[PDB]
Amino acid sequence: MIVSDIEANALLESVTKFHCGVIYDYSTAEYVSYRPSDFGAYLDALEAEVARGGLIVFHNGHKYDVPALTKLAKLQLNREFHLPRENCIDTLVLSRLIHSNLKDTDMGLLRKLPGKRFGSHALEAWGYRLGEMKGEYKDDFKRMLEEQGEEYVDGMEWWNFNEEMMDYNVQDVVVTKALLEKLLSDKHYFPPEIDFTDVGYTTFWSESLEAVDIEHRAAWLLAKQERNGFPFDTKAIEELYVELAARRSELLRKLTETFGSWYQPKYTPVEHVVFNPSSRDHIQKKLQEAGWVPTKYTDKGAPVVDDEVLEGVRVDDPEKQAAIDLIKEYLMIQKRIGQSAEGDKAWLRYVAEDGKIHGSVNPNGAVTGRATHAFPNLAQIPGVRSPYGEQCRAAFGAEHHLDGITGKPWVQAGIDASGLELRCLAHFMARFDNGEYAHEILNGDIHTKNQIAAELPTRDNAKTFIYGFLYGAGDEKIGQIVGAGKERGKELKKKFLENTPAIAALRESIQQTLVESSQWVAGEQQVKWKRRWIKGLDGRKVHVRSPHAALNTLLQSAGALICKLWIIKTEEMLVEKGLKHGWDGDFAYMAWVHDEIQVGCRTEEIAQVVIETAQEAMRWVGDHWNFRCLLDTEGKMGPNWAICH
Amino acid sequence: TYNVWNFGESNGRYSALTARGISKETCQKAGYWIAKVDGVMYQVADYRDQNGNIVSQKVRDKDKNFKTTGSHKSDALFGKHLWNGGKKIVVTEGEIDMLTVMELQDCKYPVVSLGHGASAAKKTCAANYEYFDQFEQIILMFDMDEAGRKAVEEAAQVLPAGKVRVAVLPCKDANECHLNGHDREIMEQVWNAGPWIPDGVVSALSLRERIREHLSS
Amino acid sequence: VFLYHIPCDNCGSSDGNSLFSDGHTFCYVCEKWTAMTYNVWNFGESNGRYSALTARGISKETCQKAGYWIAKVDGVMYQVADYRDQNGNIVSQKVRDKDKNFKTTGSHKSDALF
RNA sequence: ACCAGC
Ligand SMILES: Cc1cn([C@H]2C[C@H](O)[C@@H](COP(=O)(O)OP(=O)(O)OP(=O)(O)O)O2)c(=O)[nH]c1=O
Ligand SMILES: [Mg+2]
Ligand SMILES: [Mg+2]
Ligand SMILES: [Zn+2]
Helix, strand or coil: CEEECCEECCCCCCCCCEEECEEEECCCCCCEECCCCCHHHHHHHHHHHHHCCCCEEECCHHHHHHHHHHHHHHCCCCCCCCCCCCCEEECHHHHHHCCCCCCCCCCCCCCCCCCCCCCCCCHHHHHHHCCCCCCCCHHHHHHHHHHCCCCCCCCCCCCCCCCHHHHHHHHHHHHHHHHHHHHCCCCCCCCCCCCCCCCCCCCCCCCCCCHHHHHHHHHHHHHHHHHHCEECCCHHHHHHHHHCCCCCCCCCHHHHCCCCCEEEECCCCEEEECCCCCCCCHHHHHHHCCCCCCCCCCCCCCCCCCCCCCCCCCCCCHHHHHHHHHHHHHHHHHHHHHHHCCCCCCCCCCCCCCCEECCEEECCCCCCCCCEEECCCCCCCCCCCCCCCHHHHCCCCCCCCCCCCCCCCCEEEEEEECCCHHHHHHHHHHHCCCCCCHHHHHCCCHHHHHHHHHCCCCHHHHHHHHHHHHCCCCCCCCHHHHCCCHHHHHHHHHHHHCCCCCHHHHHHHHHHHHEEEEEECCCCEEEEECCCEEECCCCCEEECCCHHHHHHHHHHHHHHHHHHHHHHHHHHHHHHHCCCECCCCCEEEEEECCCCEEEEECCHHHHHHHHHHHHHHHHHHHHHCCCCCCCCEEEEEECCCCCCC | CCCCCCCCCCCCECCCECCCCECHHHHHHHCCEEEECCCCEEEEEEEECCCCCEEEEEEECCCCCEEECCCCCCCCCECCCCCCCCCEEEEECCCHHHHHHHHCCCCCCCEEECCCCCCCHHHHHHCCCCCHHHCCEEEEECCCCHHHHHHHHHCCCCCCCCCEEECCCCCCCHHHHHHCCCCCHHHHHHHCCEECCCCCCCCCCCCHHHHHHHHCC | CEEEEECCCCCCCCCCEEEECCCCEEECCCCCECCCCCCCCCCCCCCEECCCCCCCCCCHHHHHHHCEEEECHHHCCEEEEEEECCCCCEEEEEEECCCCCCECCECCCCCCCC
């Protein structure tokens, strides 16, 4: 087992130069350094470590280091170099699953961290936590160039090579080894009967928990689909931007003549301030003097202003009744502009040269093992039920990537699971009601007959209502879904509670398992804990933040892992079938939101093979962990991501 | 503008160059130093006469501006005072190139620099004709730009014939090739460069394909 | 750039205040933010006010971000625009009124932009 | 505090 690091010229997008590399060994204990002219010897040492049957340790290796090696081995000295995934291990993957809760333990330590590293899984943060850090590189470099005449306001301190970069690389691999000796010192994930510094690639994975393999495979898959990208249309979204930019310039000239300007107190200094529809304070003052009583006070001195109070509002002047709809439309168009093009993290400022968008996908960002998305966020664009929703999802299509050998568009297949957490709930409480609850779920659609038996107008309101009622609501927040008072909210809870009397029994069992005593305060709550963590489906310690949300962190944390194994198995079957992954192959992963997957492929027969093998992969997921239920998905075929939602 | 800035009154200090790759020994040998006046650290270059008398300063700031201390002479060369003889000189375009060549040769060859640049190089090479007579070979080292080609073409007219040889570089000039690690390819250009051929005259044998091309038109 | 959330002190909320890399905080609930002539005219001396133009239509924030401010000196109304440099300092000014009295104060360069 | 998602 070796521990190595890299230094490059820039990020993974455009990397063209190797600088230095330090390899430390657990068999000879040598700081084997390398040079810019010694990159071939570095690759020979890595291939000798691969061929002997060992493991190579990196930090953020799946996302950054391994494709940088693969690119620099080809574009500098023209030789193929591929690392197997069963030999490369990462320390940033292990930092997220053992220590999955840093924001709830960073206080009391902030005396150590400067403040900018608050809850950071970066290696400099752990160097500050392990108290092994002989200064920084960026700040010392900036201080050196401010000591010299030439200043460097850019902040990309990886152009030239020197010896200080070698010294901080040695410091970086020392910090990496210091993180690895602590992260391997856990007893719940690694059994304390064998040393993990001398085992092969068939022993380190097969003599530990299942959670350490699935997370590294998911990190490999998510780094690969991050490297793949997502096709995007530039002209169709500029047409939308030039469409809805001349709309808010009409909604301000027409509106300020209705709601006039006024003087505001700054001998008494006054100012001539005009109506700003973006502020929620001016609209409140203009609805006070228009003859309206809010009858709703969330704040201690101010009413609430949102979409549900601007619908049931009546004034005497009939012009303001039509103007409030224009105010709501202006706020919607303002949010559309802020999300689409004019935002700091907008769509048009993260488009690559090949017309694609590469988004950061964090595999373990939530406290319940749910993956998050950032820079940009591709899982929060408006749906088809929202206004200007179909015109946005038509641009995020897979038919905008012509093939490089034929010049033809491709076909997008989107596969969603229906009733995931509600079927997992039937899996958990099957030992209480003897398992006659998951049979009605398999008998037709559950949300349709729930809508019929609950007289909700839409299926979406019923799907919102059932997960509102299930995850610990109140008396008014689920009466707010139907718009009635607390009496209907009480009678619907008494209706849906007496149907299946196994939810309260499972809740009482979980409360008897976790908590033992709970002292009550009139303004707080003092809870003496007994077991803070919950064993998951793979022995992972799932953290609990609040005791009345234990059903939440027991349900959705067990629902993400089956999807995380299913997205692995649905390509492990296709690779063994004899297909090819990548843009020059047969299929390519594009987007993985919490429920559905979006794959893009060349011909429709490949989409048929994918939609056939997805059910078999989901069946293997349901069979591998011995589930009492029967899992099922549903797929759609189309040109873009407006039909396949 | 005022006077020659002394290092004592301006808090002079000899340091290295991290962003360009020059240690403090070369700037100690030459006299390119750093003043701390008005808060902002100013870079400043020193000019000397043949005997060693300080005659001119070149003041540059953090934001690429120029400041002359007074009467800038036409025979002002950066590095002329240190060497008074030799068989092979290298004339650099700027001032960091001469320090870069001093770094890669351990202070062996007589290497100087210009005082005007590529704009008024012909006047300062015509006014320094008597200094180049005591030498045996001259290696012109200019930028790989259109202005650099114009300077190496037109400034090589007032020079003595038979002693001018021009080297080529893959970078902009020698300093980025020092930064990109091309320290072996520059020494061959110092030792074996190309003579003063491409002025505009052609050979009788080099046209053999091109006359064919006009024969195929 | 945004980093994370801190509990506010004015509104007293838990996730209302946000911390930035520049050192300033901003709360979303309480809305509190923390941290010729040859003479360039001073802003506070000539009664500088960021008034929004009414007859043609320009918001106040554009006049704040551009530096086009109204002076009320000598009982009249002037519209002073400011020309700056790359360093972030006022280089020159332009004065415009109803009679279009072009009184360009300061060192007006030949390559001045806005 | 608001908006969107699953
Ligand atoms: C809308 C919503 C869904 N969820 C859960 C329910 C699901 O397990 C997952 C995604 O929900 P959905 O995909 O919207 O619902 P579904 O998969 O049960 O049905 P279908 O595919 O036929 O439309 O997230 C919440 O926890 N809170 C929510 O507000
Ligand atoms: Mg690294
Ligand atoms: Mg679904
Ligand atoms: Zn606040």
